[PDB]
Amino acid sequence: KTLEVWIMPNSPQPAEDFKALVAPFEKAHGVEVKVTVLDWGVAWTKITTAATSGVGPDLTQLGTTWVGAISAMGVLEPVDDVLEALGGEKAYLPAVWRTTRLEGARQATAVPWFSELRAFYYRTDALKAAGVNPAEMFASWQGFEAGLARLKASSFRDPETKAPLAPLCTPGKNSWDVLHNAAPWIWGAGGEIVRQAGGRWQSALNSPESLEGLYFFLSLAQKGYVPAESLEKNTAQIEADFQAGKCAVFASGPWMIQRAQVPEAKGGFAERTAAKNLGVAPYPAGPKGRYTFFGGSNLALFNFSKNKPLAKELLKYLGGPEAQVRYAQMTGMLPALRSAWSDPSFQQNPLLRTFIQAAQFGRTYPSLAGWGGVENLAVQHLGMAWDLVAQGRLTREALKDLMDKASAAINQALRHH
Amino acid sequence: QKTLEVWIMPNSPQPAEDFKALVAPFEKAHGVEVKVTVLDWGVAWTKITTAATSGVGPDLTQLGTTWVGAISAMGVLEPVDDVLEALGGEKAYLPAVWRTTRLEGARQATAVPWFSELRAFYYRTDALKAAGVNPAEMFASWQGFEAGLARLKASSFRDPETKAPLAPLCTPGKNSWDVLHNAAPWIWGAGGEIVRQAGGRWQSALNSPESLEGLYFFLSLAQKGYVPAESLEKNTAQIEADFQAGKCAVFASGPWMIQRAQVPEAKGGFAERTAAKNLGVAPYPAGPKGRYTFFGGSNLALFNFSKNKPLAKELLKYLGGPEAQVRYAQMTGMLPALRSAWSDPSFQQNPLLRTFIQAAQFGRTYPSLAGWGGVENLAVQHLGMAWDLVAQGRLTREALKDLMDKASAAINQALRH
Ligand SMILES: OC[C@@H]1O[C@H](O)[C@H](O)[C@H](O)[C@@H]1O[C@@H]1O[C@H](CO)[C@@H](O[C@@H]2O[C@H](CO)[C@@H](O)[C@H](O)[C@H]2O)[C@H](O)[C@H]1O
Numbered sequence A: 001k002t003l004e005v006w007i008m009p010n011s012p013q014p015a016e017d018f019k020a021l022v023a024p025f026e027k028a029h030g031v032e033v034k035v036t037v038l039d040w041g042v043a044w045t046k047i048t049t050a051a052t053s054g055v056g057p058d059l060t061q062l063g064t065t066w067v068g069a070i071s072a073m074g075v076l077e078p079v080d081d082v083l084e085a086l087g088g089e090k091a092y093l094p095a096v097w098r099t100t101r102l103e104g105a106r107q108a109t110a111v112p113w114f115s116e117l118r119a120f121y122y123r124t125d126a127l128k129a130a131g132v133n134p135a136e137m138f139a140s141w142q143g144f145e146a147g148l149a150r151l152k153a154s155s156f157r158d159p160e161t162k163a164p165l166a167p168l169c170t171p172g173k174n175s176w177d178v179l180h181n182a183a184p185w186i187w188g189a190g191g192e193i194v195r196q197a198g199g200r201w202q203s204a205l206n207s208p209e210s211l212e213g214l215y216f217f218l219s220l221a222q223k224g225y226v227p228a229e230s231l232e233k234n235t236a237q238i239e240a241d242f243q244a245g246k247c248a249v250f251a252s253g254p255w256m257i258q259r260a261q262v263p264e265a266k267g268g269f270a271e272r273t274a275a276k277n278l279g280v281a282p283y284p285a286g287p288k289g290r291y292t293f294f295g296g297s298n299l300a301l302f303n304f305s306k307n308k309p310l311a312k313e314l315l316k317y318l319g320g321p322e323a324q325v326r327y328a329q330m331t332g333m334l335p336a337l338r339s340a341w342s343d344p345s346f347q348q349n350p351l352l353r354t355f356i357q358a359a360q361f362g363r364t365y366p367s368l369a370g371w372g373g374v375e376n377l378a379v380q381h382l383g384m385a386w387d388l389v390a391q392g393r394l395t396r397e398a399l400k401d402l403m404d405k406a407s408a409a410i411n412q413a414l415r416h417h
Numbered sequence B: 001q002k003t004l005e006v007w008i009m010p011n012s013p014q015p016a017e018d019f020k021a022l023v024a025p026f027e028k029a030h031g032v033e034v035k036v037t038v039l040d041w042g043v044a045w046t047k048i049t050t051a052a053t054s055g056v057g058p059d060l061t062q063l064g065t066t067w068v069g070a071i072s073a074m075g076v077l078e079p080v081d082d083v084l085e086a087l088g089g090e091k092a093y094l095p096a097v098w099r100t101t102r103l104e105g106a107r108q109a110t111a112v113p114w115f116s117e118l119r120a121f122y123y124r125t126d127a128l129k130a131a132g133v134n135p136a137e138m139f140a141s142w143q144g145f146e147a148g149l150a151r152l153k154a155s156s157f158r159d160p161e162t163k164a165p166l167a168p169l170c171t172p173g174k175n176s177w178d179v180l181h182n183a184a185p186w187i188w189g190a191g192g193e194i195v196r197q198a199g200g201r202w203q204s205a206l207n208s209p210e211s212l213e214g215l216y217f218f219l220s221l222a223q224k225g226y227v228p229a230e231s232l233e234k235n236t237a238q239i240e241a242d243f244q245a246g247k248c249a250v251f252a253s254g255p256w257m258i259q260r261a262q263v264p265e266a267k268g269g270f271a272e273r274t275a276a277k278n279l280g281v282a283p284y285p286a287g288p289k290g291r292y293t294f295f296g297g298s299n300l301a302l303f304n305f306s307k308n309k310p311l312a313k314e315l316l317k318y319l320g321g322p323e324a325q326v327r328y329a330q331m332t333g334m335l336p337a338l339r340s341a342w343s344d345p346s347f348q349q350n351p352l353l354r355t356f357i358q359a360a361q362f363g364r365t366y367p368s369l370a371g372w373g374g375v376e377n378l379a380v381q382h383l384g385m386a387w388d389l390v391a392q393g394r395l396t397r398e399a400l401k402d403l404m405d406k407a408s409a410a411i412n413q414a415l416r417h
C-alpha cells in the first residue's frame, strides 16, 4: 500500500531528506511513501494540470499563496479533521491558520507544513571594511541606500574571488521571488499588491504609494548598486552568486542558515568565505510601515486520491510535533506548528533568532482564487520594470504605464485564468 | 574507505538516483563509494567556476561541451589523453565530439565525451492534423515553418485535457543557455554565426547582417503572435512543462523528451499527458544558406586538484565505455558520445530518435574557446533583452542592431579576457 507526494526543493537533497523524514511513518504503517520533487518554476503548471486532469499525487506541497487558488477549483479534500487532531486553530499562529483555506471558505483544504519569511543576508567582512553599521543600514530606506553607496565605493575584495562584491544582488526574472522581493518596498511605502474596491479585488500596483515603493527599489539598480547581470537572473542564480562571494547583500529565507552549515557535496556552501562571514538583518522600515514577506508551504490532499485515510495519517504525522522539528532542522525552515518554535534547537541559533523575531513585521497576500495567475503576471511585469533599468529607460512615467498594464492583466487574472 | 565526488546536471528524470544505479557496478568492483551532487544548469557555470578559482570541489564534474575550452583555459583540468586512448582514441568519436575534448589549439584533451544531444522540433500530431499542416512541408523551409505556424494560430483545435487552444510555438525567453542554442540555427541558416576569426582573434558576429537577418526572423515569430508573450519570460524547464501540459503545439528540444514521454509524472516524465500520446519530431527547416541545428552534449572532466586521480580516471574509462554509454543513454534519452554505442537497438529501433540521428548530419557546434562561458552568459543576457523588445512592441531592425552591437562589445571583452 502506497502514497505519492509531490514536494518542492526545500532541503539540499530534497527526495533523500524527505524519505529520511517519513522512514519512521513507513515502518509504523508498513507503507511506501513515494516522493517526486518539482522545481518552484514548474510547480504551478504541474499542480494546476493535476487539478484540471483529475490525475496526480495523493499529497502535494502547496505554497501558502496558492492554497486559495487550488482550493477554488474544488479538487482538495477537506482536512478540518487532521487540523483538529493536531490541536485545532489554537495550535497555529493566526497568519498560518489563514493559509489553511481560501479566504471566506467554511472548510480547511491545507495542513500547515513549514513557515518562512524574508530578511537580508549580508557579508559581515564586507560591511565592516566599507564602514557600514548593519543595524543603521537595515533600519530605514535612507540607511539602506546610504549603506549600498558605501559598499559600492568600498575597495574590499572577496579573499577567494580577489574581485569587488556587488552591493546588492536581486533576481530580475523568472522566480515568484521577483514579486516577494518587491512586496516589502511596496508595503513599506503604504502600497499593496491588491485591494478590495466595492466587493471586488483589484491590482493596487499602480497606486501612488505602490509606485513610490517599487520605484525606490528599482532605482537601486539604476544607481549601480545592483549589477545589470543580476536583472536577467532568477533566485537560484542570485543565491549561487552570494555563496560564490560576488554580492555583499541579498534577501532570502531562513533555509540559507542551514545551507551555510553543510558542505557543497550535500548541497550547502560551508566551505565558502560567505558562510564564515554571514550576518542577517530584517527589512528596513519604509515611510508608512515595516514589512517583510511571510509565507511557507502547506500539504493538500487531492479529492481524487484512492488512499484518503492513509494520506490523512501522513498529514497528521508531517504536521505533528516530531516531524515538524525534524523537517525544520533538515530544511532550515520554521515549523508551521506554533509550539515547535519554542524547541531549544531553534532558540539557540543566533541568525535564526533574527528571523523568528522579524516575524513581527511578516505580511502575506490575501488567499484569493486568482492568485497563481496574479503571481505569474506580477513576475512577468516586474521582470519588464527591471528591463527598463537594464535599458536606461526607467522614469516615473514609464513605470506608471507598465504597472497600469500589469494592473489590467492582474484584474483579468482575479476574475478568471 | 575510498570515495569519489561527482557533480552532474539533471540529465535524467531522477538524476542522482539514476546516476547511482549507473555507477553501482563500478562501486561493487572497486569497493569505492561515488557521491553525486546535482547542479541545475542555471547555477552550474557559477559552481564549476567557483570550484576552479577556489581549488575546492569534486573529483569529476559534468561539463557542457561548449564549456570544455573555457574551464580548460583556467588551468584546472587534468589531461585525459590516456583515458581517451584506452576508449579507442580519435576514431572512436565523431569529429564534432572529438573537438569538444579540448580547448581549441591545445595539445592535450581535458574532457571525456559522456553523451551527445542535438535539437529538433517536437510537435503535437493531433494539433497539426486538425490544423491541416503537413509536417514535411512545415519543417522543410523557413517559409513552410511560418506558414505552418499561421495555420496552427488559426486552428479551432483545443487540447482534450486543457479544453483550451495551443500556442503554435513556445520558446524560452530568459535565463537558460537554450536562449542561445535556440537562436543559433536561425543565425546559422541565414549564413550568420555567433563568432568569427578577424585580425587573428575570435570576435562576436551576432551583429553581422546575416546573424541579424536570422535572429530577426526568429524574434518576428513572437511579434506575429505565434509565440505567447508569457513564453518570453520563461526558461527551458517551464517551456518544457508547458508543452507536457498541453499548452504548445511546437517546441525545440533534445532527444531526452522521447524518454520523458514514456515515464509517469511520479518518476519525472509525462506519460499521463495527451502530448505523450500525440508526439511527433521534425528537423529544423533549411534557411536560405542551408540546414543547421545545435549539436552539443556533455563531457566529464577531472579537476587537477583531485586527491584521487588514478581512481577518477578508472571511473572516467567506465563512464566513457560501451556498457555505461548505452546504459546512461537509455536512462537519460541522450545519444551516446561513443560512436560504437549508437548500434544498440534502444537507439536504432527508436523511430522518434531516428529523426535526431538523421538531424546529426546538419549538426553544428560552437568553437571550443577560452571565455565561452562568458560569451554564453552575455549572449543569453542580450538575447533575453531582444525578446523584451518584442514584449514591449519595440522590435525594429535598428533596435535589434543596437542591442547586438552592445552584445558584441561585451562578448569581445569575454573572448579577449
Ligand atoms: O532543466 C533540465 C532540462 O530538463 C529536461 O527534462 C532534461 O533533464 C534536460 O537535461 C533539460 O535541460 C537542457 O539540457 C541540455 C542538454 O544537457 C542542456 O544543453 C547543454 O547546454 C550546455 C551549456 O550551454 C552546452 O555546453 C551543451 O553542449 C548542451 O548540451 C541545456 O542547457 C539544458 O537547459
Ligand SMILES: OC[C@H]1O[C@@H](O[C@H]2[C@H](O)[C@@H](O)[C@H](O[C@H]3[C@H](O)[C@@H](O)[C@@H](O)O[C@@H]3CO)O[C@@H]2CO)[C@H](O)[C@@H](O)[C@@H]1O
Pocket (backbone or CB within 6 Å): A009, A010, A011, A012, A040, A062, A063, A064, A065, A066, A116, A175, A176, A177, A235, A236, A237, A239, A253, A255, A259, A294, A295, A296, A297, A375
Ligand atoms: O510564490 C510561491 C511560493 O513561494 C514560496 O517561496 C519559495 C520561493 O518561491 C523559492 O524560490 C525559494 O527557493 C529556494 C529553496 O527553498 C531552497 O532549497 C534554496 O536553497 O533553493 C531555492 C532557491 O534557489 O523557496 C521559497 C520557500 O519555499 C513561498 O514560501 C510561498 O508562500 C509561496 O506560495
Ligand SMILES: [Cl-]
Pocket (backbone or CB within 6 Å): A192, A193, A194, A364, A365, A366
Ligand atoms: Cl498585498
Ligand SMILES: [Cl-]
Pocket (backbone or CB within 6 Å): A015, B014, B015, B016, B017, B018
Ligand atoms: Cl534523484
Ligand SMILES: [Cl-]
Pocket (backbone or CB within 6 Å): B193, B194, B195, B365, B366, B367
Ligand atoms: Cl558560431
Ligand code: NA
Pocket (backbone or CB within 6 Å): A012, A013, A014, A015, A016, A017, B016
Ligand atoms: Na535527493
Ligand code: NA
Pocket (backbone or CB within 6 Å): A045, A046, A049, A050, B241, B244, B245, B273
Ligand atoms: Na503537467
